[PDB]
Structure formats: C-alpha cells, structure tokens
Design a protein around this ligand. Structure first.
Ligand SMILES: [Zn+2]
Length: 66
DNA sequence: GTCCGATCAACTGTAGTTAAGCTGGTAAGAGCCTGACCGAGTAGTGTAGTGGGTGACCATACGCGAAACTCAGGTGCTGCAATCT
C-alpha cells in the first residue's frame, strides 16, 4: 500500500548498489560488522564504511604530516 | 492511528584493565568400555472351545428276478350205452 515509499526504497537501493556498495556490505552492516582501524596503536571502530574510510584517510593525512 | 518532543542510552571524541603461556610436577574436568539390573519388547506359546467334514453303518426305495400258491388245464381208462352188423 505504501507505493511511493516502496518506490523510494527500491530506487534508493539501486542508487546505493551503484554507489560502490557490493550489496554484501548492506547485509554485513545488519549482521553486526563494525569496521576497525589497522594502523599501529589505533583500534577505533565504525558502524558504516564511509566513517571507516574517513578514519583511514586521517591516517594517510598523519603519514603526510610525518 | 498519529502527533509533539522529552529523554535512556545509541554511537560518538580518548584513558587505563583483561588473557595466553612460560619451568614444573600435579589433581582437576570430561571421559571410555566391560560389566551388572531391572523394565519393557518381540512374539510364539498354552490350554480350551466351536465348528465342519470324513467315515461307517443303516434302511429305504425301485426294479429284476426267484420261488410261492391258486385255480383250472390235461391225461387215460372204462361204465354204460348205441351204431353197425
Ligand atoms: Zn586508526
């Protein structure tokens, strides 16, 4: 019955599946996958991949500062 | 059913508590297989009774033959009479 809302969810899924998400990411994000830092003496955690990418990019910035 | 927005804690910035396994000599979990003990399972059994069909012996029936019994056929003389002589 929620027809325009269903169209909104459907087209938004199709957008997000084109915006580099493998789909298996959307599954893993419900299952319990937190991303975690891998750098020396970093261990911080994120509930979305964009926040993890920003955090790893801040480590690239740290390497550039050094 | 839905509307406002307060509000436990969702998800978000760094400061300080948790194993694993090393030297050992060691008792602690988690365990294995043979054995024993009763409950229940697999299922053919143990008397006991209802029915049925086989077998023997009988008598009843007809139908053909066997001997019985009744009633009338058949033999042969001669007492008496009649034809031929
Ligand atoms: Zn990090």
């Amino acid at each position: 019955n929620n027809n325009v809302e269903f169209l909104q969810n459907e087209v938004d899924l199709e957008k997000r599946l084109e915006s580099g998400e493998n789909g298996l990411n959307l599954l893993l994000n419900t299952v319990g996958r937190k991303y975690r830092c891998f750098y020396n003496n970093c261990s911080r955690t994120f509930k979305t991949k964009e926040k993890y990418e920003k955090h790893i990019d801040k480590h690239k910035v740290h390497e550039l500062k050094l």
